[PDB]
Amino acid sequence: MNSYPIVLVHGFMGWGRNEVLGLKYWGGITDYEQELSSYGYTAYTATVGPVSSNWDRACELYAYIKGGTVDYGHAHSTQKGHSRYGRTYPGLYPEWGNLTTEGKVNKIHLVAHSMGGQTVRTLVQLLKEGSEEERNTTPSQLSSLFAGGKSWVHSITTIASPHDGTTLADGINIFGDFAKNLVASLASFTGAGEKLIYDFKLDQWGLNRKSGESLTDYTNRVFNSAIWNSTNDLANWDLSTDGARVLNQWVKAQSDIYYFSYSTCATVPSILTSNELPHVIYMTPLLYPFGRFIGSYTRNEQGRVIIDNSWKPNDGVVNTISQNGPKIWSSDKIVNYNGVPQIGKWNSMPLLDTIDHMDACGIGTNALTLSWYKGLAEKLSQLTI
Numbered sequence: 408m409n410s411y412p413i414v415l416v417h418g419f420m421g422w423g424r425n426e427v428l429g430l431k432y433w434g435g436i437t438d439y440e441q442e443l444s445s446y447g448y449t450a451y452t453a454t455v456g457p458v459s460s461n462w463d464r465a466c467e468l469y470a471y472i473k474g475g476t477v478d479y480g481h482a483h484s485t486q487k488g489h490s491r492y493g494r495t496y497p498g499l500y501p502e503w504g505n506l507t508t509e510g511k512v513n514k515i516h517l518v519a520h521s522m523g524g525q526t527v528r529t530l531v532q533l534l535k536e537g538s539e540e541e542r543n544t545t546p547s548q549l550s551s552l553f554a555g556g557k558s559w560v561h562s563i564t565t566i567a568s569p570h571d572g573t574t575l576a577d578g579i580n581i582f583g584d585f586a587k588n589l590v591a592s593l594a595s596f597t598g599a600g601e602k603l604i605y606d607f608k609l610d611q612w613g614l615n616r617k618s619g620e621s622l623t624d625y626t627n628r629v630f631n632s633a634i635w636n637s638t639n640d641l642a643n644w645d646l647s648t649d650g651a652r653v654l655n656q657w658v659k660a661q662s663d664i665y666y667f668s669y670s671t672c673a674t675v676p677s678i679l680t681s682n683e684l685p686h687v688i689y690m691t692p693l694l695y696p697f698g699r700f701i702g703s704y705t706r707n708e709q710g711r712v713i714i715d716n717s718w719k720p721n722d723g724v725v726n727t728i729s730q731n732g733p734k735i736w737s738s739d740k741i742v743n744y745n746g747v748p749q750i751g752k753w754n755s756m757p758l759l760d761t762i763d764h765m766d767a768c769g770i771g772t773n774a775l776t777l778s779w780y781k782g783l784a785e786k787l788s789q790l791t792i
């Protein structure tokens with residue numbers, strides 16, 4: 408069968424287990440990761456920059472899993488204006504990619520939500536073929552990620568992911584409004600207020616919280632920065648229809664990886680339940696204005712992705728049409744899941760209807776259950792070598 412562990416990868420504005428006390432990104436007030444492990448399905452939780460680029464998140468992901476210090480790359484860092492080196496991690500799974508005594512390879516299943524879907528596609532692209540750019544120009548001490556030849560991932564499951572981007576990020580200004588409100592929403596919903604533990608992890612830009620700085624001031628200083636308009640190396644570019652398109656050109660479906668994609672769609676009500684993330688201004692559900700914005704945004708400009716009525720359905724954060732797999736500037740094959748997993752292609756699962764964006768990772772009035780994720784892990788462990 409299969410005994411590869413599961414590594415969970417949060418999306419846009421996602422947070423790690425040591426942050427936002429009282430609310431797990433994966434499961435809300437249930438710890439899905441630990442429950443899955445208690446059922447015998449080993450699961451780990453990776454943490455990456457809630458608003459960094461996919462390239463940056465992919466590098467953080469490699470280090471977070473394998474172990475070591477984050478290397479954004481010699482070439483990439485310089486071209487974008489980074490710190491080349493990031494944080495250092497013990498590693499969730501140090502033996503990742505090794506061989507057993509019997510010479511089998513230690514692979515993992517990547518399960519990703521939202522932007523994480525893009526991130527892990529990027530990770531496997533770097534695993535398999537590294538970066539020719541980095542291998543050429545690097546003095547010494549190059550990051551192992553960029554070598555290539557590493558087949559360490561067995562499957563990729565993406566949930567509510569913007570494989571063709573989101574019109575939420577095309578609106579530019581509403582991207583920052585969404586970010587600010589999500590933090591504000593978390594602080595209210597947990598009761599943490601200004602003492603909420605949340606970090607944007609932008610130290611490679613020098614944008615780390617100062618001492619004695621309030622969460623609110625820290626948040627505003629981050630998204631009022633000039634960086635957002637000057638670089639194309641942040642989430643706001645990669646989440647757009649324009650940037651995702653670009654990513655799609657060079658991040659391709661690998662041959663030896665099973666791909667599963669789940670799609671979400673919802674109309675968010677205006678009435679607020681105590682069971683969901685609130686909008687701190689409107690006293691509606693958090694996703695209410697964003698769902699309406701996306702559902703009414705169209706665009707017919709030359710040179711950009713044409714955005715028509717088929718783009719209006721969404722889950723409050725991501726257009727539904729964008730989630731079955733990368734289509735735009737992509738050659739990835741997308742297939743309807745028949746019951747037999749087809750390797751090398753995207754197995755597009757039946758639509759998760761009336762599931763909004765936060766529902767999908769376990770938070771909300773229609774949250775995917777612990778039992779649902781148990782079902783997913785079972786499926787992933789039934790995949791043959």
Ligand SMILES: [Zn+2]
Nearest residue numbers: 460463487640
């Ligand atoms: Zn970068």
